[PDB]
Amino acid sequence: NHNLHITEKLEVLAKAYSVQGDKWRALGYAKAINALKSFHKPVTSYQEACSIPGIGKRMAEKIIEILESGHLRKLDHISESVPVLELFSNIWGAGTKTAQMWYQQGFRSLEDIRSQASLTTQQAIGLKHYSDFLERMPREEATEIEQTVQKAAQAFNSGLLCVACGSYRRGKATCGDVDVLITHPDGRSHRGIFSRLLDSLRQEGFLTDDLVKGETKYLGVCRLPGPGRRHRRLDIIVVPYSEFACALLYFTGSAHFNRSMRALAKTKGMSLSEHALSTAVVRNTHGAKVGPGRVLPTPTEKDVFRLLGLPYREPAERDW
DNA sequence: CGGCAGTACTG
DNA sequence: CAGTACT
DNA sequence: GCCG
Ligand SMILES: [Mn+2]
Ligand SMILES: [Mn+2]
Ligand SMILES: [Mn+2]
Ligand code: NA
Ligand code: NA
Ligand code: NA
């Protein structure tokens, strides 16, 4: 990154706006930061800064203060609440509104939350694993987790296909969590397996806590056996084979990549989700779907790219 | 002016 | 529903 | 915050 001396200051503002709930301003900062982290050379001119997509007048100004000053004075007026809001919103299941409410009620530490806050079931689990959920795991451990789920699934039906997605599939050396997609080529025998699969993984002691138990999504907590093991976040999604490519695409990400691809689809009168790529989608003036359109056949990820008019990208080049 | 992705749970 | 989460 |  040609421009760390700027980006590092901007990220502090981005996080501050984010934990305070100012989601769109934070989004603007996030995009400018990436734009600047992928510029070839250092930024040296206000009109060079303004040169970059995702950097406008306000952001060019800030970068000009940074290079002439070495500093950004807005940093000195960030509310004293922000570190605490960040502390609280790093509890799984607590976001900006919950963090702000706890702050308003006088909470300042996780000890305050533990002893005095009313927690949802999810948030109590999040708090119990507060440290573990902030830590990444080696790639090799994600493999063991993927393989544990697959062996449990295949025990019921040898035909079940299980694939670790997320950062694992984008090739990263460490992973924040494990994202396992399950389907079945027969288009049928994925149905109703969660009951048995989760029960099997629980029987082991492998699954330690459940956060979400939906008909198609599971989000929870696992821990491999033996000493030196941390609790890890595990997500499982079960999908019909007709949706495999779009589910794979979704679940592999990155998040920014998905949002970028979905924005593109919208420009073309199409819609892309975890379920399907659709065409002839009808939307209102405000960008909201008011007519569904037609599902397009997407047997493979490459088909989604092709139908969108884009060159295929392997998972590793989707790490946006 | 106003969208900024699209979707799934929770209670 | 608002809130939070997933990529 | 940015951009159409
Ligand atoms: Mn993940
Ligand atoms: Mn995950
Ligand atoms: Mn632990
Ligand atoms: Na620009
Ligand atoms: Na949180
Ligand atoms: Na008190």
Side-chain angles (χ1 to χ4, degrees), chain A residues 1 3 5 7 10 12-14 16-22 24-35 38-40 42 44-46 48-50 53-54 56 59-63 65 69-71 75-134 136-150 152-160 162-171 173-187 189-190 192 194-195 197-198 200-202 204-212 214 216-284 286-288 291-301 303-313 315-316 318-320:
Chain A
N1 165 27
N3 325 62
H5 43 293
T7 283
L10 291 193
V12 173
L13 271 173
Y17 286 124
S18 184
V19 304
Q20 294 167 123
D22 191 353
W24 302 123
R25 182 142 22 232
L27 181 63
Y29 273 81
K31 281 177 163 154
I33 285 164
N34 291 331
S38 71
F39 204 63
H40 48 90
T44 57
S45 148
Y46 169 111
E48 180 175 36
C50 214
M59 188 79 11
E61 279 155 10
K62 292 176 212 293
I63 309 154
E65 169 162 14
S69 76
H71 197 232
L75 292 185
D76 299 323
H77 300 289
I78 299 188
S79 163
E80 65 181 342
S81 63
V82 156
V84 172
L85 295 175
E86 177 178 5
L87 179 80
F88 291 169
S89 63
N90 280 337
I91 299 172
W92 203 98
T96 183
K97 301 285 190 178
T98 300
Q100 292 186 103
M101 191 208 75
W102 285 337
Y103 192 88
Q104 189 288 319
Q105 293 184 0
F107 299 79
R108 295 292 181 269
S109 70
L110 295 183
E111 171 55 23
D112 290 344
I113 300 301
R114 182 201 74 71
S115 63
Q116 285 173 268
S118 274
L119 300 171
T120 63
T121 303
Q122 292 172 337
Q123 288 161 354
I125 293 161
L127 177 60
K128 175 166 58 170
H129 298 306
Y130 189 89
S131 289
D132 279 359
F133 289 178
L134 292 174
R136 296 180 78 82
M137 77 191 85
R139 184 172 183 82
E140 296 61 33
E141 184 173 351
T143 307
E144 303 179 84
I145 287 166
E146 171 192 49
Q147 288 298 113
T148 301
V149 178
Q150 184 182 133
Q154 289 167 354
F156 291 107
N157 179 317
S158 147
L160 289 169
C162 312
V163 194
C165 300
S167 59
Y168 185 78
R169 180 164 189 258
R170 298 196 305 280
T174 70
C175 302
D177 43 73
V178 186
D179 304 304
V180 178
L181 180 62
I182 301 180
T183 190
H184 194 293
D186 80 2
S189 312
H190 66 292
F194 258 133
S195 58
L197 170 64
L198 298 175
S200 189
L201 296 169
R202 223 180 261 125
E204 281 190 57
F206 177 68
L207 272 194
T208 62
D209 302 270
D210 304 335
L211 295 163
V212 161
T216 65
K217 307 200 309 188
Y218 169 85
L219 295 81
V221 187
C222 65
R223 184 173 63 178
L224 295 159
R229 296 301 199 163
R230 309 316 301 173
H231 287 89
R232 309 296 196 187
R233 281 275 294 103
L234 170 62
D235 295 347
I236 301 171
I237 299 167
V238 177
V239 307
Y241 194 68
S242 55
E243 304 183 357
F244 183 42
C246 285
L248 200 54
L249 191 65
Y250 159 69
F251 220 26
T252 301
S254 74
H256 178 233
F257 175 83
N258 285 348
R259 290 170 84 157
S260 294
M261 175 142 290
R262 293 165 178 209
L264 180 66
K266 183 176 276 186
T267 70
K268 313 194 152 196
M270 290 149 94
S271 188
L272 174 67
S273 73
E274 32 262 73
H275 296 292
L277 175 74
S278 304
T279 188
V281 187
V282 180
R283 307 171 153 95
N284 62 17
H286 306 274
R294 309 195 295 287
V295 171
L296 292 168
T298 55
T300 64
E301 292 184 308
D303 287 289
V304 179
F305 285 85
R306 184 182 53 75
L307 293 156
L308 291 177
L310 311 154
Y312 177 67
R313 296 176 164 257
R318 313 182 198 162
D319 199 37
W320 299 5

